[PDB]
Design a protein around this ligand. Structure first.
Ligand code: 6VZ
Ligand code: CA
Length: 223
C-alpha cells in the first residue's frame, strides 16, 4: 500500500496472509473454512495465516492453517487476468473470534464514488521498494468504468473495476494482490493488477467480486 496508514493490530480481522515460506499474497476470510483470493496467487503449499498484524512477529492472536483445496475460477485467463478469483478451503476450520472474522459477500454491485478500504502487506514506495511488515490500509473510491477503460485501453473487462486516485500518490502495490477491497461491509474487490503503483492515470485494477457471488456460494456448498 502506497500512501496509506498503519491499520492498527487486528482492525481488519478478515485480512489473511498467504504464506509459502514467506508472504506472497493477501486474501479474505469468507467463512470459517474458506478464503477468497486472486487466481494469479495460485500455487502449491499454501499456508493461510489469520489474525496477523506484523507478519514477521508472532504476537499471540494468529492461526496458521494449511490449504487443503484450491479452486481457481473456471474461466480464469492468466494472460489477461479476466476472472482473477480463486477459493481456498482450509484443512481445518478457523476459530472465529474478534481478531479472526469473516467478511460478507456483496448482494449487489457497488458504484463509482463508493468509498472502500483496501489493505495489505505490500510495497509502500511508488519508486523503489520498502515492505512494512505491519498491515497497511487505504481509503479509496471506486472509479467510473469509463475512466478505468480510458486509463487502461484494451485491458479492462466487465469483471474488473478501478479504484483509487487518478492524480497518483495512493494505491495498492506489489504484495497486496489477492487482498480485500471492502465497501460498506461487503467484499466488493480483490486486489488484482495495475501499471506501476500510485502513478498518475494508472489506478489499481480489482476483480469485481459481485459478479462471482453465485459461483462462490455454489462452490462452497458443494465442497
Ligand atoms: C509480489 N506480488 C505482486 O507483485 C503481485 C502480482 C500481480 N500481478 C498482476 C499482473 C499479472 C500477474 N500474473 C499474471 N499476469 C499478470 O498480468 C498479465 C497482464 C494482465 C493485464 C493484467 C500478477 C501484481 N501484484 C501486486 O501485488 C500488485 C497489486 C496492486 C497493484 C496496483 N498498483 C499492482 O500494480 C503493479 C501490483
Ligand atoms: Ca502477527
Amino acid at each position: 500500500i502506497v500512501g496509506g496508514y498503519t491499520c492498527g493490530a487486528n482492525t481488519v480481522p478478515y485480512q489473511v496472509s498467504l504464506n509459502s515460506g514467506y508472504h506472497f499474497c493477501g486474501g479474505s476470510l469468507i467463512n470459517s473454512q474458506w478464503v477468497v483470493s486472486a487466481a494469479h496467487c495460485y500455487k502449491s503449499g499454501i499456508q493461510v495465516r489469520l489474525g496477523e498484524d506484523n507478519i514477521n512477529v508472532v504476537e499471540g492472536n494468529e492461526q496458521f492453517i494449511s490449504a487443503s483445496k484450491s479452486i481457481v475460477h473456471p474461466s480464469y485467463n492468466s494472460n489477461t487476468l479476466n476472472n482473477d478469483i480463486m477459493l481456498i478451503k482450509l484443512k481445518s476450520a478457523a476459530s472465529l473470534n474478534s481478531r479472526v472474522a469473516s467478511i460478507s459477500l456483496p448482494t449487489s454491485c457497488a458504484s463509482a464514488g463508493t468509498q472502500c478500504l483496501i489493505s495489505g502487506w505490500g510495497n509502500t514506495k511508488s519508486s523503489g521498494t520498502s515492505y512494512p511488515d505491519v498491515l497497511k490500509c487505504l481509503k479509496a473510491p471506486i472509479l467510473s468504468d469509463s475512466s478505468c477503460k480510458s486509463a487502461y485501453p484494451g485491458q479492462i473487462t466487465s469483471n474488473m473495476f478501478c479504484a483509487g486516485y487518478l492524480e497518483g500518490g495512493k494505491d495498492s502495490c506489489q504484495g497486496d494482490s489477492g487482498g480485500p477491497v471492502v465497501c460498506s461491509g461487503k467484499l466488493q474487490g480483490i486486489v488484482s493488477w495495475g501499471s506501476g503503483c500510485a502513478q498518475k492515470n494508472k489506478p489499481g485494477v480489482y476483480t469485481k467480486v459481485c459478479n462471482y457471488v453465485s459461483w462462490i456460494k455454489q462452490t462452497i456448498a458443494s465442497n
